mmCIF file of C-alpha atoms and ligand atoms in Angstrom:
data_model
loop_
_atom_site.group_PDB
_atom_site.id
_atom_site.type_symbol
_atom_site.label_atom_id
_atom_site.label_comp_id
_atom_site.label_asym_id
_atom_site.label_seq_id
_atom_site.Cartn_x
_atom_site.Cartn_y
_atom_site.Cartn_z
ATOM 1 C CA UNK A 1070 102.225 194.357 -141.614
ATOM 2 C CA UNK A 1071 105.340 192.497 -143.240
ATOM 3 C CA UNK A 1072 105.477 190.293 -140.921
ATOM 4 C CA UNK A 1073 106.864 186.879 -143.022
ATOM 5 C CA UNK A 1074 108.140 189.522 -146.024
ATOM 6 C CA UNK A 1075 110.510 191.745 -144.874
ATOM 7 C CA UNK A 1076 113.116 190.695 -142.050
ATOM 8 C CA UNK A 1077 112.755 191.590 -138.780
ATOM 9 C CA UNK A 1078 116.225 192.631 -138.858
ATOM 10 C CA UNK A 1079 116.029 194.499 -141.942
ATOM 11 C CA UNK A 1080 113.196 196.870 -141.111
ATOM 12 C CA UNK A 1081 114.751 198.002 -137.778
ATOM 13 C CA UNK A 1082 118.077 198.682 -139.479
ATOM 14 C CA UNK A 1083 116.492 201.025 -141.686
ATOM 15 C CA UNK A 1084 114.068 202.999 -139.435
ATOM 16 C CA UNK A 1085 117.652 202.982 -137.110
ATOM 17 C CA UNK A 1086 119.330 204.890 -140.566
ATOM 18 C CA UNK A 1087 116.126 207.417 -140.857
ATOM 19 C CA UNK A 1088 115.115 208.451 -137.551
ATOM 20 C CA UNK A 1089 116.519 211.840 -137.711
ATOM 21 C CA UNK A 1090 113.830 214.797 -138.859
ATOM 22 C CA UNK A 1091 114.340 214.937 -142.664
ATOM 23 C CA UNK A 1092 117.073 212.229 -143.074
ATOM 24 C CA UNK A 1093 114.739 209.742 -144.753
ATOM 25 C CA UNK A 1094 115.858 208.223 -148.614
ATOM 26 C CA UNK A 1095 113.211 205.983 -150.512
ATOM 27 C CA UNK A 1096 116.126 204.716 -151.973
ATOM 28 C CA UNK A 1097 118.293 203.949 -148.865
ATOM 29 C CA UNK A 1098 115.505 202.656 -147.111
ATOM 30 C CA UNK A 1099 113.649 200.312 -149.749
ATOM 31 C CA UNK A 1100 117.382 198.853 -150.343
ATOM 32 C CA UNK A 1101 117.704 198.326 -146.462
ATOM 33 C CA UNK A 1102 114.282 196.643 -145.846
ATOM 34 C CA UNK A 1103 115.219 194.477 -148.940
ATOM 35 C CA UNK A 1104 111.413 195.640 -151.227
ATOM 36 C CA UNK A 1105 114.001 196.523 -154.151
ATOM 37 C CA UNK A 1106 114.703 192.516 -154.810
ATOM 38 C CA UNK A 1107 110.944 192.080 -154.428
ATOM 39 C CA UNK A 1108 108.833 190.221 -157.411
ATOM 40 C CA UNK A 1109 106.257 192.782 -159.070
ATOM 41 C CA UNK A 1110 103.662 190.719 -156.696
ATOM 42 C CA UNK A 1111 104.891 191.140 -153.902
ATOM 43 C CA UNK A 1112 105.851 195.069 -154.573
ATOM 44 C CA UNK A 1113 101.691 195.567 -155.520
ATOM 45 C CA UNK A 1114 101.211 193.618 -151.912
ATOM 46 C CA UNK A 1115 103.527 196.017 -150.473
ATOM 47 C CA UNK A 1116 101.741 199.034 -152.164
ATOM 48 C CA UNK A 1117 98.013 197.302 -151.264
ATOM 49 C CA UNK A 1118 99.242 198.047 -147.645
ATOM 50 C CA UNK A 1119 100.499 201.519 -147.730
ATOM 51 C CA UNK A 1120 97.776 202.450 -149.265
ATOM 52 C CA UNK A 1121 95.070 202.607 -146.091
ATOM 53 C CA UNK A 1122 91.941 203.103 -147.855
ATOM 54 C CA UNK A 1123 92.118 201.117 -150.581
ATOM 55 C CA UNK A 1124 91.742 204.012 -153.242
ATOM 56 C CA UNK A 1125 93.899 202.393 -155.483
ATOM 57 C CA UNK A 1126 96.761 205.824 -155.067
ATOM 58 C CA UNK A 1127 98.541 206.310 -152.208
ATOM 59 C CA UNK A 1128 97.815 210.610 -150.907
ATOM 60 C CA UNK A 1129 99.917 212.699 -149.346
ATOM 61 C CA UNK A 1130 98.365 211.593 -145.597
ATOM 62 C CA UNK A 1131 99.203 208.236 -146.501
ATOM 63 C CA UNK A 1132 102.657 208.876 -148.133
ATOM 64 C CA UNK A 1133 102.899 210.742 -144.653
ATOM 65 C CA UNK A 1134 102.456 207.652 -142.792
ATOM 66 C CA UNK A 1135 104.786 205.425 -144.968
ATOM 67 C CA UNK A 1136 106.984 204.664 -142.170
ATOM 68 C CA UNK A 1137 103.863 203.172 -139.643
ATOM 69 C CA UNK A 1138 103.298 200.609 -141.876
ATOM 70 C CA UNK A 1139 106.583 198.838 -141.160
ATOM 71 C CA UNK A 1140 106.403 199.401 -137.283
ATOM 72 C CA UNK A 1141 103.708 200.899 -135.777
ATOM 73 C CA UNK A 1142 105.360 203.124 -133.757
ATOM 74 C CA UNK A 1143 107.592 204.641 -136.539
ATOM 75 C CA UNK A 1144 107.515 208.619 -136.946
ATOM 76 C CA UNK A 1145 105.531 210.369 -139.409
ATOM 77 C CA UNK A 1146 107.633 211.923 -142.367
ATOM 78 C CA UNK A 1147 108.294 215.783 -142.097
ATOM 79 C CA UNK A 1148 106.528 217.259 -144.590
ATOM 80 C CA UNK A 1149 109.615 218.124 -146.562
ATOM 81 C CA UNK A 1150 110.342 214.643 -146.653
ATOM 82 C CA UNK A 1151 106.945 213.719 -147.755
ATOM 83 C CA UNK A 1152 106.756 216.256 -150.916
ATOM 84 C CA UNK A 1153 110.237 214.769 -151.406
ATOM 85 C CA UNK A 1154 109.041 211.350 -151.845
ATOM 86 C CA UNK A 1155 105.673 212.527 -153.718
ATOM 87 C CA UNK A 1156 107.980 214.264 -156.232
ATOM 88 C CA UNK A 1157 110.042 211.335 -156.925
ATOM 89 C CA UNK A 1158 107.203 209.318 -157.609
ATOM 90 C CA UNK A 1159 104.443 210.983 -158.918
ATOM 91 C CA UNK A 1160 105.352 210.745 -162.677
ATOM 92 C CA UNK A 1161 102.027 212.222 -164.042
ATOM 93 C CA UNK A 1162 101.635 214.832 -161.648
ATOM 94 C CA UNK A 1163 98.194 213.926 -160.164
ATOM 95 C CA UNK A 1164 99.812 214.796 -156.533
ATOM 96 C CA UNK A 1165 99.226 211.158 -155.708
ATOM 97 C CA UNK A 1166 101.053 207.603 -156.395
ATOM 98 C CA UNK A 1167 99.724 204.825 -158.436
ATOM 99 C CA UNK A 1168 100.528 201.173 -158.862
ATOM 100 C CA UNK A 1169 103.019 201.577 -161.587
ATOM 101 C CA UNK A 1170 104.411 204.948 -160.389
ATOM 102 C CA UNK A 1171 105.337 203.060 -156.785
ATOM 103 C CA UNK A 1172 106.371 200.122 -158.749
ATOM 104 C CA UNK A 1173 109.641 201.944 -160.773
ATOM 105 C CA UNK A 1174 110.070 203.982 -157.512
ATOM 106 C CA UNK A 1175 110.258 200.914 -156.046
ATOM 107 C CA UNK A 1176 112.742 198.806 -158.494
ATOM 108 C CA UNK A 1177 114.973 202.117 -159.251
ATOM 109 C CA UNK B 1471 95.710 184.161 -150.773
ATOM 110 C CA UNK B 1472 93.091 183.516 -147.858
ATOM 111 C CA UNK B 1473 95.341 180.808 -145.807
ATOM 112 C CA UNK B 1474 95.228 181.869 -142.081
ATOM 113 C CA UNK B 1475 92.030 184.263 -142.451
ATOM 114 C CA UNK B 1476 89.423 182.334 -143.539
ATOM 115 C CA UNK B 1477 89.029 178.179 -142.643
ATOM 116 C CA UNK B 1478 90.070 175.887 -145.492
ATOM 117 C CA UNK B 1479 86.765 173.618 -144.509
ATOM 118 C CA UNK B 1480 84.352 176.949 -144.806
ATOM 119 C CA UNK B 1481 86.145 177.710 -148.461
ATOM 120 C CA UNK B 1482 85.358 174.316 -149.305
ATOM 121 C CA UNK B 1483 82.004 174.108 -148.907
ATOM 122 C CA UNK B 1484 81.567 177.561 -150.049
ATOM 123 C CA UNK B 1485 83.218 176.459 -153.557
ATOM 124 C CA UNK B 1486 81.180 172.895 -153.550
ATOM 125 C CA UNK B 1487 77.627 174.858 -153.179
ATOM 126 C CA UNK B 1488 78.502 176.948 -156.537
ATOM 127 C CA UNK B 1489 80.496 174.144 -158.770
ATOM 128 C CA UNK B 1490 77.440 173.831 -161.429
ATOM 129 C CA UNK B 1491 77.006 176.801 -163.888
ATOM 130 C CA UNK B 1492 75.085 179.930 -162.803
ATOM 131 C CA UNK B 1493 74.685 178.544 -159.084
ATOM 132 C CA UNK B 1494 76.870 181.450 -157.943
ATOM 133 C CA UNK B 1495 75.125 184.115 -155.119
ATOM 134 C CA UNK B 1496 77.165 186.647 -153.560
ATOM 135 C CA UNK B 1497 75.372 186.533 -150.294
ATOM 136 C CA UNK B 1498 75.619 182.483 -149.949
ATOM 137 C CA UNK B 1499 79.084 182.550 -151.114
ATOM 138 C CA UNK B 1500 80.193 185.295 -148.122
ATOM 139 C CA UNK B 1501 77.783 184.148 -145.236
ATOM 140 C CA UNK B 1502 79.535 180.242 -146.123
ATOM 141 C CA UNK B 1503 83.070 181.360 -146.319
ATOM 142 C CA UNK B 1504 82.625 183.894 -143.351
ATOM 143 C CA UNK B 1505 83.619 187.230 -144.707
ATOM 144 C CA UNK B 1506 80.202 188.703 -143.678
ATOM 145 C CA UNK B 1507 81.679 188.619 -140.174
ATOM 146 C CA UNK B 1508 84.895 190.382 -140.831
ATOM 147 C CA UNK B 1509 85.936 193.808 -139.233
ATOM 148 C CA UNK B 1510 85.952 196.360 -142.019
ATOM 149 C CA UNK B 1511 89.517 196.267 -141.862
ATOM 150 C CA UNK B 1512 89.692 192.563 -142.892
ATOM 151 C CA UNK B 1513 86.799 193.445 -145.456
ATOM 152 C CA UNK B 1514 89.402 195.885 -146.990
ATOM 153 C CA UNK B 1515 92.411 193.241 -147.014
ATOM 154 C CA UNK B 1516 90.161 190.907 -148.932
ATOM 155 C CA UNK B 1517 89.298 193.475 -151.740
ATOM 156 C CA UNK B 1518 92.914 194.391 -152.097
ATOM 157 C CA UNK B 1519 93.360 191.049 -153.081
ATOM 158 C CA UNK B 1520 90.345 190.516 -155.185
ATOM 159 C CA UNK B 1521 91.451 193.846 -156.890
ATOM 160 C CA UNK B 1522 94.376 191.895 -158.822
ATOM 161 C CA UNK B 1523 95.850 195.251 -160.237
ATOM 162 C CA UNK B 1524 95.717 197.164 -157.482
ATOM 163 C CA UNK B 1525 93.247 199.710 -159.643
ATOM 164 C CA UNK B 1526 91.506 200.133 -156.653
ATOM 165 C CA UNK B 1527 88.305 198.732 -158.204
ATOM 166 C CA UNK B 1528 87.563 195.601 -158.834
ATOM 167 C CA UNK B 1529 86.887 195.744 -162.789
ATOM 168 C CA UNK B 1530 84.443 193.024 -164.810
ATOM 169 C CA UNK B 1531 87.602 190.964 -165.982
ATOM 170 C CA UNK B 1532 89.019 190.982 -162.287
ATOM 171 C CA UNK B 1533 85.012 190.112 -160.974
ATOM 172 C CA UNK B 1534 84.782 186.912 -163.508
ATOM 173 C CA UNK B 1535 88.029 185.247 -161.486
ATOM 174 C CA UNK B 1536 86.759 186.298 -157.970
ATOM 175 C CA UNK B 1537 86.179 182.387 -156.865
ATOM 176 C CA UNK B 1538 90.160 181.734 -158.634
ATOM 177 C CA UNK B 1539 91.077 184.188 -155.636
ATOM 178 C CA UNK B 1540 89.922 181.560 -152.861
ATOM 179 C CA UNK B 1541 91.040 178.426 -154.333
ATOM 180 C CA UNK B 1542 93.370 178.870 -157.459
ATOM 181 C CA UNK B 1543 91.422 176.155 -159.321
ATOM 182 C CA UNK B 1544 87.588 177.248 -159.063
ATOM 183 C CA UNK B 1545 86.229 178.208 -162.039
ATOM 184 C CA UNK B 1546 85.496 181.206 -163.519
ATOM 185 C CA UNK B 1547 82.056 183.143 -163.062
ATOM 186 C CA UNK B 1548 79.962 182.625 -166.079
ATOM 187 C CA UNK B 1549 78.794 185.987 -167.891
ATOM 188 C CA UNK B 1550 75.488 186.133 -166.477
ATOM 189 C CA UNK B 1551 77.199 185.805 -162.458
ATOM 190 C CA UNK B 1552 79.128 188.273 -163.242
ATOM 191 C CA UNK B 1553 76.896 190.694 -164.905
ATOM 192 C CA UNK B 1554 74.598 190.199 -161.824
ATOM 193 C CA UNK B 1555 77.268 190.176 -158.991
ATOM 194 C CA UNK B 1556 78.149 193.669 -160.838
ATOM 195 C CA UNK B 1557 75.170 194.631 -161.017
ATOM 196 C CA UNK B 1558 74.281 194.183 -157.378
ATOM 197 C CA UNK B 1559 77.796 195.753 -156.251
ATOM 198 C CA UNK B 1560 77.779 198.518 -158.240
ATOM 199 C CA UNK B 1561 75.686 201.280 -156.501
ATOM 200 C CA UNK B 1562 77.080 204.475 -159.006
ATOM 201 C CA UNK B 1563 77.072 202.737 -162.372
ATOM 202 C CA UNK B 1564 80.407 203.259 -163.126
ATOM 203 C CA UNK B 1565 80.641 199.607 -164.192
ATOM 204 C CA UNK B 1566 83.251 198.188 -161.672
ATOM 205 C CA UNK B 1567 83.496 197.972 -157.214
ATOM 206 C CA UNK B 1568 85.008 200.272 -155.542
ATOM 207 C CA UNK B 1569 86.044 199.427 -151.890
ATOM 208 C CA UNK B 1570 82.861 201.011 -150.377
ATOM 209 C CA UNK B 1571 80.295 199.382 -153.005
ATOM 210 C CA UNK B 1572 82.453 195.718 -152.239
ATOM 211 C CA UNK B 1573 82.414 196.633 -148.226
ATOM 212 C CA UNK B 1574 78.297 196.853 -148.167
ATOM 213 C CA UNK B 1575 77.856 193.854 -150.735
ATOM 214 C CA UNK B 1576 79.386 192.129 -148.013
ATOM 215 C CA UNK B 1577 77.683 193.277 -145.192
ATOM 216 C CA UNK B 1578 74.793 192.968 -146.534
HETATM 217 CA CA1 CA C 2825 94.832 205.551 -150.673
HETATM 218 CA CA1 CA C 2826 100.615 210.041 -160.002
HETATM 219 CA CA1 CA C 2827 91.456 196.157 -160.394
HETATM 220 CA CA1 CA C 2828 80.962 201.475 -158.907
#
């Protein structure tokens, strides 16, 4: 779903970088697919996405799935990865992510 | 933000119909602009984007500016549309749409 956003290019270089069980880096791979030089817009489009349902937080299933949303055939995080990624972000400790929370995880 | 979904001619007339103060109905507004036909999937896209803070509800403020979210210029919902488009939406009372409420106001 970041079709005109992203860069082609971009997005396979860094699914390439993380398709090893457990090797994945929100940092790495938001730098790679080029979301850290993203307006504040755009980075609450990118979050609208991840976030399936529309609950306004993005759960641990979808958190899961982070990687799909890029290209559809893109493995499912380990779940080491996943609590990783929750943990970095969740800043309140509700076990989920919210606009703001993906925002700074986002931006660094 | 509704460039290659909707029809620029069905926005249009959807936005002429409601020009004059307290005009506005949900139900003409979606059947004219064709949302009513949308996959649930598309129905979701266009609530993320109505949903200007990703909150995941669509809050009164947010509800006021839904035309602004079609055509950047429309006007603004006067308090009585909104109060009534709320009112219609919001089947638990909590005061603002959730993605289910908005995906059955649209549906009809
Ligand atoms: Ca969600
Ligand atoms: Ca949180
Ligand atoms: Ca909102
Ligand atoms: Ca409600």
């Amino acid at each position: 779903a970041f079709a005109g956003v992203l860069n082609d290019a971009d997005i396979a270089a860094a699914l390439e970088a993380c398709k090893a069980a457990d090797s994945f880096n929100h940092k790495a791979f938001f730098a790679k697919v080029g979301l850290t030089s993203k307006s504040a817009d755009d980075v609450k489009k990118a979050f609208a996405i991840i976030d399936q349902d529309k609950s306004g937080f993005i759960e641990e299933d979808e958190l899961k799935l982070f990687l799909q949303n890029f290209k559809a055939d893109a493995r499912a995080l380990t779940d080491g990865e996943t609590k990783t990624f929750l943990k970095a972000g969740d800043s309140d400790g509700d076990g989920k992510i919210g606009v703001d929370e993906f925002t700074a995880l986002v931006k660094a």
